[PDB]
Amino acid sequence: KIPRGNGPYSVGCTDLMFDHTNKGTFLRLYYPSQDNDRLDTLWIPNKEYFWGLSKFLGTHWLMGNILRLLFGSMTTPANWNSPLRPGEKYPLVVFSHGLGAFRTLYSAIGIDLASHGFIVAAVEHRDRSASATYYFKDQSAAEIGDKSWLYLRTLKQEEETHIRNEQVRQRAKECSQALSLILDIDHGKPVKNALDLKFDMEQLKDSIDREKIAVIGHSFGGATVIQTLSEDQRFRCGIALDAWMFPLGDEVYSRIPQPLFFINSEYFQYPANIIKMKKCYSPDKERKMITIRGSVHQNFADFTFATGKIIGHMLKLKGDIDSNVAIDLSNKASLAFLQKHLGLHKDFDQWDCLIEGDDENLIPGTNINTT
Ligand SMILES: Cc1ccccc1-c1cc(Nc2nccs2)ccc1C
Ligand SMILES: [Cl-]
Numbered sequence: 132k133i134p135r136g137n138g139p140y141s142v143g144c145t146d147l148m149f150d151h152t153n154k155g156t157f158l159r160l161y162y163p164s165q166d167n168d169r170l171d172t173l174w175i176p177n178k179e180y181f182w183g184l185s186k187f188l189g190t191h192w193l194m195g196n197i198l199r200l201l202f203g204s205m206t207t208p209a210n211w212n213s214p215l216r217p218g219e220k221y222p223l224v225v226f227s228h229g230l231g232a233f234r235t236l237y238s239a240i241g242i243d244l245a246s247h248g249f250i251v252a253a254v255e256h257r258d259r260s261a262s263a264t265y266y267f268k269d270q271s272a273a274e275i276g277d278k279s280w281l282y283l284r285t286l287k288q289e290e291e292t293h294i295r296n297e298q299v300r301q302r303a304k305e306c307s308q309a310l311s312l313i314l315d316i317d318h319g320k321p322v323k324n325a326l327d328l329k330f331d332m333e334q335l336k337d338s339i340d341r342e343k344i345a346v347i348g349h350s351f352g353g354a355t356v357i358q359t360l361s362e363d364q365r366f367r368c369g370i371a372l373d374a375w376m377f378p379l380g381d382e383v384y385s386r387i388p389q390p391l392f393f394i395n396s397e398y399f400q401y402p403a404n405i406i407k408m409k410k411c412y413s414p415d416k417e418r419k420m421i422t423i424r425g426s427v428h429q430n431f432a433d434f435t436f437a438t439g440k441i442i443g444h445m446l447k448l449k450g451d452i453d454s455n456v457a458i459d460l461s462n463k464a465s466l467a468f469l470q471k472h473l474g475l476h477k478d479f480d481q482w483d484c485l486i487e488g489d490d491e492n493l494i495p496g497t498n499i500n501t502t
């Protein structure tokens with residue numbers, strides 16, 4: 132089970148695609164909900180995500196069918212299409228998924244953020260870093276729900292530097308474009324969702340605290356955080372969850388004026404990666420780094436809750452730390468960081484000491500010795 136949020140708000144979930152093309156925005160929205168009696172949200176909504184996943188894992192597409200058999204009816208505890216809780220402007224997080232992932236796979240994070248009074252836009256990237264994604268060739272195809280699927284691109288070694296850097300830049304543009312979409316919906320612009328869903332986007336009118344905007348992401352998405360901040364000053368701070376820094380151009384490192392928080396797993400990180408994180412440091416910049424003791428790369432994704440302890444450890448989906456314990460640390464330290472750098476009037480400062488890595492399951496800074 133994906134954990135429910137720890138916050139006081141009930142959580143709703145919906146999908147938004149606008150426009151309908153490969154260049155439009157696709158996001159999953161997590162939001163404080165009025166009601167708490169809807170159907171739970173389907174975690175992986177289409178068979179083709181499973182084909183994509185099994186390509187990314189390097190198995191036959193028929194393994195996709197077995198993954199579908201095992202995981203295809205799994206839900207996440209968010210009220211599908213629930214009405215948005217009224218009477219309050221909400222801060223906004225744009226969320227970027229890792230390589231081989233897609234918009235739905237960080238609901239433990241998205242639900243928890245939403246339960247504390249955030250609207251969360253988890254983008255689905257069309258850079259061919261997702262396992263799978265879909266869009267519509269044209270208006271006719273959108274109208275009859277005739278989906279065109281785009282699958283993960285495998286790179287030759289010669290393509291790595293260049294294609295990863297082209298992808299992190301498209302990712303950033305996709306994050307800004309998602310933000311401008313939500314801001315326009317907030318500023319009342321009528322938008323026709325390319326998905327025929329029973330959630331009126333008009334609910335989102337006057338619902339965003341327009342100055343309180345952050346960008347968060349895991350792995351490839353953690354590099355997207357940094358690229359996004361350097362390109363789009365509307366984002367006021369970012370949190371890179373076990374960022375994979377390789378996609379970033381040399382030019383970005385001196386170009387990040389916003390506060391930036393690195394939350395790392397113990398077992399993923401390596402010198403080349405930590406050196407790149409340290410290249411983001413400057414005495415006039417706000418920078419923080421913590422490491423979750425006992426944790427693996429996938430402790431930030433929902434896959435860490437999808438299996439039992441033994442199979443989980445085997446598939447490197449779980450570390451020595453309990454998954455609920457690890458995500459609570461990452462989500463609480465994130466909440467405190469967001470309160471500080473967005474100027475929120477909540478009680479998230481109760482977790483300020485986690486920003487400093489002051490917990491029995493936290494390492495301040497990094498365990499990684501560089502030079
Ligand atoms: C646990 C699980 C559930 C539903 C589909 C796939 C998996 C799975 C996932 C990984 N890891 C990944 N990390 C990023 C993308 S896929 C490994 C193994 C399995 C079975
Ligand atoms: Cl790892």
Ligand SMILES: [Cl-]
Nearest residue numbers: 401402403404
């Ligand atoms: Cl290294």
